[PDB]
Amino acid sequence: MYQNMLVVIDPNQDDQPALRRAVYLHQRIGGKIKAFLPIYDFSYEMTTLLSPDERTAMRQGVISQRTAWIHEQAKYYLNAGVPIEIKVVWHNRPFEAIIQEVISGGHDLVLKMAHQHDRLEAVIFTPTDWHLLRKCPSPVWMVKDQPWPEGGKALVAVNLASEEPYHNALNEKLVKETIELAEQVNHTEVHLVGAYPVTPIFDPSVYNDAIRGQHLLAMKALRQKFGINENMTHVEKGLPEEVIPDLAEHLQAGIVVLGTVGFLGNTAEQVIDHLRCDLLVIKPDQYQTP
Amino acid sequence: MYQNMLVVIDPNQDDQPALRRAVYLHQRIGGKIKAFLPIYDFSYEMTTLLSPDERTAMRQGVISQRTAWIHEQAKYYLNAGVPIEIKVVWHNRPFEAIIQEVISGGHDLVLKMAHQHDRLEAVIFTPTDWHLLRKCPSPVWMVKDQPWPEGGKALVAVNLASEEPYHNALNEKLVKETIELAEQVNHTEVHLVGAYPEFDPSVYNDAIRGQHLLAMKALRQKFGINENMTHVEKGLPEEVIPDLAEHLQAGIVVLGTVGRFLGNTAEQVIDHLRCDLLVIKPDQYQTP
Ligand SMILES: CCCCCCCCCCCC(=O)CC(=O)O
Ligand SMILES: CCCCCCCCCCCC(=O)CC(=O)O
């Protein structure tokens, strides 16, 4: 139950909110913590300049000092007694190194930091962030560099819509892995959100209350196995890429759980891009990464 | 020579800065314009139950609705006589649909819109923007939704540092395709930037920088540019290029990338910039 965390280190700043969040989690749930950082310098392939002696001496010469850096930035935690393993890998293509360390390693979680400049604008993602969000097999927890709202709320977005049988397991996993988590922190404020589209321009009006006929019910099929009753479940219409973020904001939600199976969701990509809170994509298992 | 433009329509707002820029270009360079927009609706995803017929009907009604919508936003350009071609394709994964239309129609340039709130802040890119920036065989012009700097300035970033001759071919492609274009549009000023990063480092630094001044002076005088507009700095390009670009009054920056997708080396350069972007594939570059 989330007890082997992989923390992605940002080499461009000193504060690592991913690490801090990992520690906060460790204080409530426990597990391992691995400060990971793929590093690289352009100096290593200019072969016309440095023979292998100089270039590899410098290759290890970066790794050592940046490992020292991560130590100097995890020092208070280490001295306080937090079991943090530090590992700096020499790698081009960062996201690749991260995913490989996830698979070889044995990880429950990946915690990376995302930026937010202004209070009510969306969080800023990098290509690396996106690669992880669609290729990383482990549940990815994107942690924004902004403090958690004092009213803690977890939000679960469900693909209620499609009657397909692989979206059902993912739903129940999303909820279950959220309930086993919220209980263990806590707060334990778990909301359930569905989003369905009403088709606007044979009578169209039947399709509408049919779409909603399934949605209200399917949403509630989750709930009575999972005991989340009506008060914090939401079924609204409009576009998911707008329905769930503003909802998350009016709700004062600090995190949202997302599910993707397989670009991987332009339906969900647009959802992510206009988000202003923490993100937890749980790719369901039973999936293999390229 | 960019005379068959593909304009990506943002379906979440009404103003299309990509279209506006495309027209602006059309007035000085000429060519065609194709207003493109990939769309998809969840109803088509509902296998049950809409009988295949009405599902195609609602498909047709969404396509029709967006054709009317895009028509209604370019009419001031259309009635005035701008050859704007509208084509709405039905696709769930937009970047795929865009690249397919690029290769199928053979387009010279793709103009898409990126947001920027604030000055001295970075530009915001979408997943679609990133797929296009690394898989689109044609030059991609990301146009921010902010007015062009009143002092027009163009900047070209080259991988001078690493010696291999296809990065050289790509370099001069960048250069030629930037000046021959600025020349025909607004006579803007095209700058060129390099970035550079027994035991003894002190020799290594001045060996690399000795190299950069080499290659920069090798490039510049084939293109008849002045040393007054060549710049070579040390530090990381992902930090070097934006500070210069803002200090230089740059409105756009031309980038050179080869697939084997785009390295993190330049990806970081892209995420941190605050002006228009023009990514150029070496050609031919083959999209999967
Ligand atoms: C589905 C997620 C349910 C658990 C949410 C985790 C709560 C995190 C609280 C963060 C508190 C902080 O602001 C960190 C700190 O003070 O160092
Ligand atoms: C490499 C590209 C260099 C060519 C310069 C392009 C100039 C475009 C300036 C846009 C002028 C406007 O401000 C008109 C508008 O509102 O779109």
Side-chain angles (χ1 to χ4, degrees):
Chain A
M1 181 42 190
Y2 283 145
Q3 289 193 257
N4 192 3
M5 319 181 188
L6 183 74
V7 179
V8 183
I9 300 296
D10 188 318
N12 293 332
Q13 68 178 56
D14 290 342
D15 182 39
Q16 305 291 322
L19 185 63
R20 185 191 306 117
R21 181 61 52 89
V23 169
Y24 186 98
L25 265 51
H26 182 69
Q27 306 298 120
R28 307 276 188 151
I29 192 184
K32 311 243 193 175
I33 300 183
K34 181 183 297 181
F36 191 75
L37 169 58
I39 203 51
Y40 205 95
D41 186 321
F42 300 159
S43 62
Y44 188 80
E45 324 93 357
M46 289 205 71
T47 68
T48 63
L49 292 216
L50 305 186
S51 79
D53 50 352
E54 291 145 85
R55 78 165 155 164
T56 80
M58 173 27 50
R59 164 203 179 140
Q60 274 57 26
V62 170
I63 295 188
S64 85
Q65 162 171 329
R66 219 152 198 92
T67 321
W69 179 70
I70 302 185
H71 189 290
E72 253 288 349
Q73 303 293 266
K75 168 211 310 174
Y76 292 80
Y77 299 143
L78 282 170
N79 175 32
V82 184
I84 302 179
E85 313 91 46
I86 309 181
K87 181 174 183 179
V88 177
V89 166
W90 186 268
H91 212 286
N92 188 342
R93 242 201 186 128
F95 80 94
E96 244 193 21
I98 298 180
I99 299 165
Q100 303 179 332
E101 194 60 38
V102 172
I103 306 170
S104 96
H107 289 315
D108 285 325
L109 267 166
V110 173
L111 288 79
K112 196 169 183 305
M113 184 268 300
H115 292 285
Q116 163 166 121
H117 62 308
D118 240 5
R119 3 201 85 241
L120 289 170
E121 323 277 2
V123 278
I124 309 169
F125 295 102
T126 71
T128 312
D129 292 326
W130 281 107
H131 280 103
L132 296 184
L133 290 163
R134 19 170 191 159
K135 310 184 184 184
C136 174
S138 59
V140 182
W141 186 333
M142 300 294 301
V143 183
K144 64 169 177 182
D145 61 340
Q146 289 269 319
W148 188 270
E150 198 294 331
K153 277 156 175 56
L155 188 58
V156 189
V158 286
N159 201 309
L160 276 182
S162 196
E163 314 178 24
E164 295 157 347
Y166 62 94
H167 287 171
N168 58 18
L170 173 60
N171 283 329
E172 307 163 356
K173 180 177 181 208
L174 286 193
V175 182
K176 175 142 159 101
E177 195 172 326
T178 309
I179 306 305
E180 287 177 349
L181 176 63
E183 268 67 346
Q184 285 174 9
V185 180
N186 52 353
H187 92 93
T188 303
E189 281 269 310
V190 181
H191 286 262
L192 288 183
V193 157
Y196 63 144
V198 84
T199 55
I201 326 138
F202 178 78
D203 74 276
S205 157
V206 283
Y207 180 112
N208 321 342
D209 303 7
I211 218 62
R212 140 187 169 262
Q214 232 201 32
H215 275 82
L216 295 185
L217 170 82
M219 160 74 62
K220 301 335 177 148
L222 275 184
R223 102 151 92 202
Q224 298 181 71
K225 229 68 183 171
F226 296 153
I228 313 173
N229 301 277
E230 293 177 350
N231 66 349
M232 325 193 60
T233 68
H234 300 269
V235 186
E236 276 57 44
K237 297 201 75 116
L239 324 166
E241 47 240 42
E242 187 50 66
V243 162
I244 77 96
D246 55 20
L247 178 153
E249 188 150 58
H250 209 279
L251 261 196
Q252 205 71 239
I255 194 178
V256 48
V257 185
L258 202 53
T260 77
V261 287
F263 15 45
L264 302 207
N266 169 38
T267 300
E269 279 183 358
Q270 282 208 314
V271 171
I272 295 173
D273 212 25
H274 308 97
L275 202 61
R276 321 157 177 100
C277 50
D278 290 339
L279 177 65
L280 182 60
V281 288
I282 299 187
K283 310 188 152 57
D285 20 42
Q286 333 110 16
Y287 155 101
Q288 193 72 252
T289 177
Chain B
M1 182 180 165
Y2 281 99
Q3 291 190 354
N4 194 16
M5 319 181 187
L6 184 74
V7 178
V8 184
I9 300 296
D10 191 89
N12 292 129
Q13 70 175 56
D14 292 342
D15 181 39
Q16 309 292 323
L19 185 62
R20 184 189 305 117
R21 183 58 49 88
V23 168
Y24 189 97
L25 266 51
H26 184 266
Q27 298 300 299
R28 301 190 142 91
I29 306 182
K32 313 159 211 174
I33 295 184
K34 180 185 297 181
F36 193 76
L37 170 58
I39 203 49
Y40 203 94
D41 185 82
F42 157 73
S43 62
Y44 194 80
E45 239 194 286
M46 288 309 283
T47 270
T48 186
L49 197 277
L50 300 186
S51 85
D53 285 347
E54 69 277 354
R55 258 163 36 196
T56 81
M58 286 192 183
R59 161 202 178 136
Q60 280 162 16
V62 173
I63 292 188
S64 89
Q65 156 177 324
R66 300 298 183 89
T67 324
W69 179 69
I70 302 185
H71 191 291
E72 202 91 68
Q73 306 292 42
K75 67 174 187 171
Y76 290 155
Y77 295 109
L78 280 171
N79 78 333
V82 185
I84 301 179
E85 314 161 43
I86 304 181
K87 181 174 183 180
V88 178
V89 78
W90 189 266
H91 212 287
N92 189 34
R93 338 207 187 128
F95 79 93
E96 186 168 339
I98 298 180
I99 297 165
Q100 301 178 334
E101 195 59 38
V102 171
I103 59 180
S104 174
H107 286 319
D108 288 325
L109 182 63
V110 173
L111 290 81
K112 195 169 183 305
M113 182 266 300
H115 311 107
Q116 163 168 349
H117 344 282
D118 263 0
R119 237 153 37 181
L120 190 145
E121 290 238 55
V123 186
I124 304 170
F125 293 81
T126 73
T128 312
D129 292 326
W130 286 110
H131 302 8
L132 296 186
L133 288 164
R134 21 166 191 157
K135 311 183 185 183
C136 174
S138 59
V140 180
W141 187 335
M142 301 294 301
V143 184
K144 63 169 177 182
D145 59 11
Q146 285 268 257
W148 189 269
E150 322 95 2
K153 281 280 181 51
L155 187 141
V156 189
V158 284
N159 254 346
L160 276 184
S162 197
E163 169 231 26
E164 21 201 305
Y166 276 30
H167 293 176
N168 193 28
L170 175 60
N171 283 329
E172 62 179 300
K173 178 178 180 208
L174 287 192
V175 180
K176 114 180 165 204
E177 284 230 64
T178 310
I179 309 117
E180 166 57 40
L181 176 133
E183 173 188 357
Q184 292 175 0
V185 46
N186 207 247
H187 300 66
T188 49
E189 277 180 32
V190 179
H191 288 84
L192 287 66
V193 61
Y196 61 107
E198 204 291 325
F199 298 165
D200 192 31
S202 318
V203 64
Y204 175 77
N205 315 338
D206 303 7
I208 304 202
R209 156 190 177 101
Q211 184 180 75
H212 278 283
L213 295 188
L214 305 186
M216 164 74 61
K217 197 176 180 182
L219 274 184
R220 152 188 40 221
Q221 46 193 342
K222 139 71 183 170
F223 297 98
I225 315 173
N226 310 319
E227 310 222 76
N228 313 87
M229 313 293 178
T230 64
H231 299 269
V232 184
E233 283 316 312
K234 217 191 221 325
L236 317 169
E238 46 260 40
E239 303 169 338
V240 162
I241 309 307
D243 311 331
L244 178 60
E246 291 290 352
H247 176 43
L248 219 58
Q249 296 292 101
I252 195 178
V253 48
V254 186
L255 201 53
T257 77
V258 201
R260 296 182 181 276
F261 59 88
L262 178 46
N264 175 41
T265 91
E267 279 183 358
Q268 281 208 30
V269 176
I270 294 173
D271 211 25
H272 306 214
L273 58 80
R274 323 120 95 105
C275 51
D276 289 338
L277 177 66
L278 183 61
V279 80
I280 298 187
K281 309 307 173 305
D283 177 50
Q284 291 177 335
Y285 159 98
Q286 190 109 9
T287 176

